Amino acid sequence: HHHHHHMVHITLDRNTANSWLIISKDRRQVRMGDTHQNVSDNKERFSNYPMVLGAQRFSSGKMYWEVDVTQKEAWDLGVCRDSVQRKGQFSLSPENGFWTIWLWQDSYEAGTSPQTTLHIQVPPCQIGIFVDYEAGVVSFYNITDHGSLIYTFSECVFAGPLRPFFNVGFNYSGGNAAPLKLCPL
Numbered sequence: 132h133h134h135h136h137h138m139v140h141i142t143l144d145r146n147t148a149n150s151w152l153i154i155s156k157d158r159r160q161v162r163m164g165d166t167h168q169n170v171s172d173n174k175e176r177f178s179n180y181p182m183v184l185g186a187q188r189f190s191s192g193k194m195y196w197e198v199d200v201t202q203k204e205a206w207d208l209g210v211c212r213d214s215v216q217r218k219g220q221f222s223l224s225p226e227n228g229f230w231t232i233w234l235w236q237d238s239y240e241a242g243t244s245p246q247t248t249l250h251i252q253v254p255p256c257q258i259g260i261f262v263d264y265e266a267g268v269v270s271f272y273n274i275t276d277h278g279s280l281i282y283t284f285s286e287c288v289f290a291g292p293l294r295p296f297f298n299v300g301f302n303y304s305g306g307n308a309a310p311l312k313l314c315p316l
């Protein structure tokens with residue numbers, strides 16, 4: 132892929148974070164804390180899952196960023212509508228306003244309804260995410276495997292401003308403490 136030139140500098144929005152998340156001072160890294168992080172509750176925070184949004188909102192153009200997933204057992208990545216549900220239980224699907232992939236129990240899947248099996252030969256340490264707003268496209272790239280395509284959502288109905296979307300995953304196993312990191316341009 133030749134999408135690198137649409138690179139955007141993403142930062143995390145503390146106010147949207149689940150109350151157990153720890154965001155770095157530079158707002159470029161997030162990890163699961165071992166307890167509540169001593170913040171007040173608000174209507175923006177994801178309540179049920181270890182999720183956070185990027186601060187940036189996109190309503191036009193082409194955007195590209197990269198995320199480091201090194202040594203994580205579980206995570207979700209992609210984009211979502213600014214108006215997605217924050218409280219209670221929900222599935223990651225385009226009908227609910229999410230365009231995502233994930234790792235879970237040694238398999239990679241795209242957040243369609245129902246979910247789609249991904250075919251990844253080289254487990255990725257860094258994921259590239261490309262959004263073309265006008266074309267209605269969200270694509271995922273394996274940076275570890277020379278930028279090979281993972282998945283393309285096409286005919287997307289965004290129906291609003293988009294925000295970068297992250298889920299660090301739970302850490303029941305003790306094997307999923309590692310952070311998500313936004314990689315430098």
Ligand SMILES: O=C(C1CC1)N1CCN(c2ccc(F)cc2)CC1
Binds near residue numbers: 201202203308309310
């Ligand atoms: O607990 C902490 C620090 C407070 C001590 N962590 C940050 C670095 N962690 C990490 C794990 C795997 C890995 F591949 C990269 C980073 C583990 C979680």
